[PDB]
């Protein structure tokens, strides 16, 4: 009966993507964290 995740790759990338993160001071720090932790998938891309 209509769940929360209703996927859309445009929305996904525009919202959470690499360039979306790069755009902002705080979004750049997220990447700096995921790199510091050492994640394989740095963003969803």
Partner RNA sequence: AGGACCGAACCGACUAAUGUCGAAAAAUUAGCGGAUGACUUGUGGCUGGGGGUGAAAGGCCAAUCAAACCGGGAGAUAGCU
Partner RNA sequence: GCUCGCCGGAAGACCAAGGGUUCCUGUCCAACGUUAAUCGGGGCAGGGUGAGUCGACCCCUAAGGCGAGGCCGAAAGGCGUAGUCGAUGGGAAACAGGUUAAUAUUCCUGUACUUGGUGUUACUGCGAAGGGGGGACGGAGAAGGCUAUGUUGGCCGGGCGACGGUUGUCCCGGUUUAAGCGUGUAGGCUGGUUUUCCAGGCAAAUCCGGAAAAUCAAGGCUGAGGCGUGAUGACGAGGCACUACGGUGCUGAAGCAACAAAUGCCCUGCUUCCAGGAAAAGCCUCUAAGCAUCAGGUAACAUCAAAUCGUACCCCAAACCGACACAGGUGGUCAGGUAGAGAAUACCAAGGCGCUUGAGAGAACUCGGGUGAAGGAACUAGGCAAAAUGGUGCCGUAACUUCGGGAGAAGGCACGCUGAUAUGUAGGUGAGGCGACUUGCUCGUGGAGCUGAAAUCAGUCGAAGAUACCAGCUGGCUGCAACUGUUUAUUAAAAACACAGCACUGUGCAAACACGAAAGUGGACGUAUACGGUGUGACGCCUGCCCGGUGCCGGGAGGUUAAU
**Interface with RNA (CB under 7 A):** 1-11, 14-15, 23, 25
Minimal distance, residue 22 CB to Mg ion, in Å: 15
Other beta carbons within 10 angstroms of residue 20's beta carbon come to 16
Give me 29's structure tokens: 């720090």
41 binds, options Mg ion, RNA, none, Cβ within 5 to 8 A by partner type: Mg ion
24-34: b (≥16 Cβ within 10 Å) or e: eeebeeeeeee
Nearest position to Mg ion, beta carbon: 41
40 binds, options RNA, Mg ion, none, Cβ within 5 to 8 A by partner type: none
């Amino acid at each position: 009966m209509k769940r929360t995740f209703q996927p859309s790759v445009l929305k996904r990338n525009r919202s959470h993507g690499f360039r979306a993160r790069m755009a902002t001071k705080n979004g750049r720090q997220v990447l700096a964290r995921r790199r510091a932790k050492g994640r394989a998938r740095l963003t969803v891309s």
